[PDB]
Amino acid sequence: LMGPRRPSVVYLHNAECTGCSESVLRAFEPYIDTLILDTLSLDYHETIMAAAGDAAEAALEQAVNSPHGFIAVVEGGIPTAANGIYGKVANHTMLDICSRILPKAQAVIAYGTCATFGGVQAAKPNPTGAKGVNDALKHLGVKAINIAGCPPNPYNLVGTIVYYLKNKAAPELDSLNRPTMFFGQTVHEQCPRLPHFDAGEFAPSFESEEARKGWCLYELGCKGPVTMNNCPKIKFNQTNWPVDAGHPCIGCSEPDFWDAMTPFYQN
Template identity: 30%
Template structure:
């Protein structure tokens, strides 16, 4: 993107002893989406959103759910940013970029100006120290780009799994980083606040991003890690109907063994996740989210074997291990997998096995 806007020159702002800005400014822009990532963010805890912003030394210039100013005040803020009068350290964009019809962007206009939001995003991105895509729609197009994509929705720097999007694959913010893709639908509030705190602390670098621009502190994990149904998975004791306790991979469409995220290790709102709530992982952090070839509650199979196998596991290994596991399934797990509540509790360990004295 062009870098010759008035906001481009080095900014005269107060700096700390390390040379970094003493406080960072953040602008949150809503594009084509449902607003669910903002709703998720407002539920942040340990720390909560405002504690995290203070910890990261971040001041919010505007946010659609948090700001009192609107109308003329908002437009004046945007004008100050684009003219270089107001520094913009962090630009957060929530929602897909709507380029239709025919690349004009007129499906989504900024209220009060008639300017396409995609043009505004591009101009602000050229000013920003860091650019963050909040949620899978902004990162890759997500649900907004699924199907026929009549709105011509895309991500900031990706279209699905392919580099591109609004800003193009070569985009770099003033920090030298590409767009940071905090993917999820919605994204976990902890992923957002942790990223913001690291940016505020000056400890986030390009090596902290994976191939698809996701922060590695959560994307280097699989949803399978920490799953509360892992014992059922190990023995291939599978649920057949929603509400049953068994593993959801074999019959009910769960792809948590292939999807990147620490959802089951970093519980939502202190205790929840999709799988803990009885729903299979549908891959909302992945660039291909929204383009699945089968219903979400159905596991596609060939010859009785799930098409989507665990990451890095050859099919022959999976078949062999699954056969052995099913042969060794304890009766307790076999019965509990098809139950809605624990039908058979674990047996009591003997005194010797539990380490108790005779």
């Protein structure tokens, strides 16, 4: 499915919504066709691969056991309650799959807040015992680079992979294992509404003339001040980001944000 030439990527889907996979399809300069044909060899990916069933399982085995080695990209949290039975693929639990494959990878990237920190299914009361990759597999020595967000900016995945392929090492990482080159600033310190924040100019409601005029969204719940991401700088889809669409940041690149940042419309 691979051999020498392009580096092999094995992409796994655990407890996920496929929004992180969709974000990679939005890749821009390079676009996803360049990435799959020229940059990398995408050797397993359940959303887009041709093979199904036994043939897909054999594709996975061939990729994982390749003497050229592979990089793993992981989407979704790992459900660990009840011996992992809340998530299975090919009748194996996701915990077992990841425990067997991820220690064999040359590098692991946990892509999206679910894979990095546990995400939406780990919010209270966490009925499936979902965990992020590093938490679930600590004991096996797996240390995934965490690219957080729900979903992350795909600029940050491509930039991390390019860095790794050039330098054969991870870039500088923060204390949540996220690259500092993308996650070193709060959303707020990069926000165009910062002068209104400083002036104590807050929108009191979404229907208000203050919201119409672009006043700060802090009183309406904005988590920009406690959230590390590059959204105001890179934007999404080459055109917009939540505060420029008039909605507060909900904190989606932070651990446990579903419980820490709620209620989303309060500060």
